[PDB]
Design a binder for this molecule. Structure first.
Ligand SMILES: Nc1ncnc2c1ncn2[C@@H]1O[C@H](COP(=O)(O)OP(=O)(O)OP(O)(O)=S)[C@@H](O)[C@H]1O
Ligand SMILES: Nc1ncnc2c1ncn2[C@@H]1O[C@H](COP(=O)(O)OP(=O)(O)O)[C@@H](O)[C@H]1O
Ligand SMILES: [Mg+2]
Lengths: 757, 58
């Protein structure tokens, strides 16, 4: 276990000659971040690199680039010895050559365009025999270091001349390229990629070791998600990482054949995959082969489904073969494929969130040159309901708008090809602002499962409510041992109630942010849709999504909707009966308590709710949320106005004193009304100052050139006289009465145990 | 509130001080209170509106 032996790990940094290590391994090996180290791999091939320090790097493993990884004939999980060299000196001449399949379309000189800023200021240690990669100019091109005069370990100095004379030569046949895809080309699904690595790597990388283990592997993995999430890409990336014999099976290619040809293709596929063990078989569009039994009319398609069921069960031979399959929804599959010894392990590849969308935009904007007007983070914040293929099409559309608008660049290249013209073109922010208007997304109908961003700072006050919520949610997650010691069952649900517009949704999102859990919101229209259409079997489909994303907070907004819509506990003669609430109670009684799924309801009419929900084992906590107090009103007025430029002359603490009895929605209303007044003043000043001043100008330009307004005192002073109270007094008295109907006790406050002798 | 404060100050200052006096008379001889800020500040939290909103709408 000597420390020079290192295991290959993926690096976060994208530099082509920089490796990374941890701090205590480097202190034990006695090295420094200024050192230029040398690596040794298989086939006597080396790579000289610059090492640095890291805290996120693990101790026994080294992080390196995929460029360094493919230039050693070394994959992940292997061993690399390292040798320090202070003998690394400067070079004499540098002779590299291009490679033909990457320069089929590009032309002209590549020296000053690519190679001159590449070796500038980085002090890159190169070696005779390495292949590096240069991105930029809407193309990535690779160069092999062919011949160097000095010793192979050398630092590129600016004094050292670089020779680029020679034909573009072909590669060695054992060399890899960018034709295949690695783990870097996939963003936004780190957890799922980690799970697939855990399932797949340890059996395939070590077949004899895992065979000596004797524990059976998984042999069927079912990827599923919305269309366009990149399931084929993930399968191909894992296949290229493990390096096993990957074979592709496409559904419509089988179903386009004749009767016997489909079975012959399936049998030849599994035979040729069992010859080249270890192997990965990928079956794309599984529902085109094996749909439900009611939908496969005819004999031949049921025969093909039975052939697949035969071969999956006959695969159990300990033959080191893993079968993956992708589909668009888990419901359309024939349920015989869900059994044990078959496709039983299921991985959910959902739609990506904002950090994921930012990573997708960073992946797709590597080669394209980019003007500094753009901010990809704001683009990722504005794209809502966008799968990664939508983002790739959006980058495509912005690039085509940028090439279209430069019709003088169409004139600049009528039929001649210049690399410098594509080098001379970048993409503005207004191209992306245009491309967001002609973008038709495909995931607005999907339920959003993500961690909220609302903190406790956006909510004013409610300190005992905050304490009781964190006691009910956070403590069984962090400290289960106390609940094992004292021996109680942790509670399962909470019902909020109160007047409208007082921050119940914000409290749910805040506790979901505090505990770092996923959040699933279900509004009133969805429950009413299930009630009108009588489609109450979708509730189990909701609770399954809640189980797949554990730990989670499941929030049912407006739980009194069907009871209000039915008769208001008055019409139709019935009392507190519902299809949908019945199915919710059944699913609450069904679920286990180990999964840490926490359910929250919220009403405005707590009298007309079904009393069978309030039993123990169900939503049994009742929390009253009143109108906000004065400090809470201060914090609400602060939290609403963080986006707006507010003048410092404005007194919010005086503003909270007048508004006795408002809700949160009234304060947001008056803030947005003051903002409307400011926008009207700015526009009607700018139109007059620009147009009405002079048509033919006296000066050369506008002498002012100054936007006048910000939000100031007279805007609030004017917008105050339109504000009104939303909640009357009798409504508040009703909530106080219902709060007193659940009163603590009478006469048990003075209970004491007797103290005698 | 002011009358209650004045009476419960005067009873304590006269009777509770000394039964057999040290000085010849009361050394203070001064009525302490008038109506001031804390009396309104305390009596505010008992005030209520007599006329609701629906009545005004009528
Ligand atoms: N998360 C992602 N990371 C990287 N590329 C992505 C991502 N999502 C989509 N893409 C790209 O968008 C396209 C999606 O291709 P596919 O792998 O076919 O997606 P898909 O989920 O397989 O769609 P189906 O179901 O096969 S029709 C490819 O060009 C991908 O490179
Ligand atoms: N503690 C709070 N801090 C700031 N704003 C709040 C707070 N509570 C409620 N609000 C305001 O209420 C609005 C949302 O109310 P919501 O949670 O939808 O009420 P309901 O659940 O009754 O519909 C937000 O626009 C927010 O400004
Ligand atoms: Mg596919």
């Amino acid at each position: 276990n000597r420390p020079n032996r290192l295991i290959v790990d993926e690096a976060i940094n994208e530099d082509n000659s920089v490796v990374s290590l941890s701090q205590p391994k480097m202190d034990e090996l006695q090295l420094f971040r200024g050192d230029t180290v040398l690596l040794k791999g298989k086939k006597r091939r080396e790579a000289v690199c610059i090492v640095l320090s890291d805290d996120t790097c693990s101790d026994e493993k080294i992080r390196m680039n995929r460029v360094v990884r493919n230039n050693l004939r070394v994959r992940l999980g292997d061993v690399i010895s390292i040798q320090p060299c202070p003998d690394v000196k400067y070079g004499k001449r540098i002779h590299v050559l291009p490679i033909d399949d990457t320069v089929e379309g590009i032309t002209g000189n590549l020296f000053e365009v690519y190679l001159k800023p590449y070796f500038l200021e980085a002090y890159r240690p190169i070696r005779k025999g390495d292949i590096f990669l240069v991105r930029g100019g809407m193309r990535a091109v690779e160069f092999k270091v062919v011949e160097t005069d000095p010793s192979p370990y050398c630092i590129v100095a600016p004094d050292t001349v670089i020779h680029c004379e020679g034909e573009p030569i072909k590669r060695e046949d054992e060399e890899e390229s960018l034709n295949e895809v690695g783990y870097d080309d996939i963003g936004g699904c780190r957890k799922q990629l980690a799970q697939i690595k855990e399932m797949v790597e340890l059996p395939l990388r070590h077949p004899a070791l895992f065979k000596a283990i004797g524990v059976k592997p998984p042999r069927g993995i079912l990827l599923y998600g919305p269309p366009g999430t990149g399931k084929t890409l993930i399968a191909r990336a894992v296949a290229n990482e493990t390096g096993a014999f990957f074979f592709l099976i496409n559904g419509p290619e089988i179903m386009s054949k004749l009767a016997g040809e489909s079975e012959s293709n399936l049998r030849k596929a599994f035979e040729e995959a069992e010859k080249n063990a270890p192997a990965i078989i990928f079956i794309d569009e599984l529902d085109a082969i094996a749909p439900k039994r009611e939908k496969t009319h005819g004999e031949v398609e049921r025969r093909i489904v039975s052939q697949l069921l035969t071969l999956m069960d006959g695969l159990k031979q300990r033959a080191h073969v893993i079968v993956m399959a992708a589909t668009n929804r888990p419901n359309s599959i024939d349920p015989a494929l869900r059994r044990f010894g078959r496709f039983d392990r299921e991985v959910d590849i959902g739609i990506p969130d904002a950090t994921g969308r930012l990573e997708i935009l960073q992946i797709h904007t590597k080669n394209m040159k980019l003007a500094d007007d753009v901010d990809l983070e704001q683009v990722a914040n504005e794209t809502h309901g966008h799968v990664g293929a939508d983002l790739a099409a959006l980058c495509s559309e912005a690039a085509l708008q940028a090439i279209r608008k430069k019709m003088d660049l169409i004139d600049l290249e009528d039929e001649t090809i210049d690399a410098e013209v594509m080098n001379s073109l970048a993409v503005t922010m207004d191209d992306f602002r245009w491309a967001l208007s002609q973008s038709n997304p495909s995931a607005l109908r999907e339920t959003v499962v993500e961690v909220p961003q609302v903190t406790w700072e956006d909510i004013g006050g409610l300190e005992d409510v905050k304490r009781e919520l964190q006691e009910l949610v956070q403590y069984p997650v962090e400290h289960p041992d106390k609940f094992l010691k004292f021996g109680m069952t942790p509670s399962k649900g909470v019902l909020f109630y109160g007047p409208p517009g007082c921050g119940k949704t914000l409290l749910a999102k805040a506790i979901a942010n505090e505990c770092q859990a996923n959040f699933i919101s279900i509004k009133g229209p969805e429950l009413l849709t299930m009630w009108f259409g009588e489609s109450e079997a979708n509730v189990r489909e909701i609770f399954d999504k809640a189980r797949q994303a554990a730990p989670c907070v499941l929030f049912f907004d407006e739980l009194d909707s069907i009871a209000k819509a039915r008769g208001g506990n008055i019409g139709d003669g019935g009392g507190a009966a519902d299809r949908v609430i019945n199915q919710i109670l059944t699913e609450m009684d069904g679920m286990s308590t180990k999964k840490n799924v926490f359910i929250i309801g919220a009403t405005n009419r707590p009298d007309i709710i079904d009393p069978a929900i309030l039993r123990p084992g169900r939503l049994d906590q009742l929390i009253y949320i009143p109108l906000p107090d004065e400090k809470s009103r201060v914090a609400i007025l602060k939290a609403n106005l963080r986006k707006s430029p507010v003048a410092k002359d404005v007194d919010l603490e005086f503003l909270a004193k007048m508004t006795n009895g408002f809700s949160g929605a009234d304060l947001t209303e008056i803030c947005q009304r003051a903002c409307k007044l400011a926008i009207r003043e700015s526009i009607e000043s700018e139109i007059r100052r620009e147009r009405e001043r002079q048509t033919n100008p006296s000066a050369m330009e506008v002498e002012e050139d100054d936007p006048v307004p910000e939000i100031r005192r007279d805007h609030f002073e004017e917008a105050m006289r339109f504000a009104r109270r939303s909640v009357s007094d009798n409504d508040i008295r009703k909530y106080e009465m219902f709060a007193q109907t659940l009163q603590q006790s009478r006469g048990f406050g003075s209970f004491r145990f007797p103290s005698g002798n």
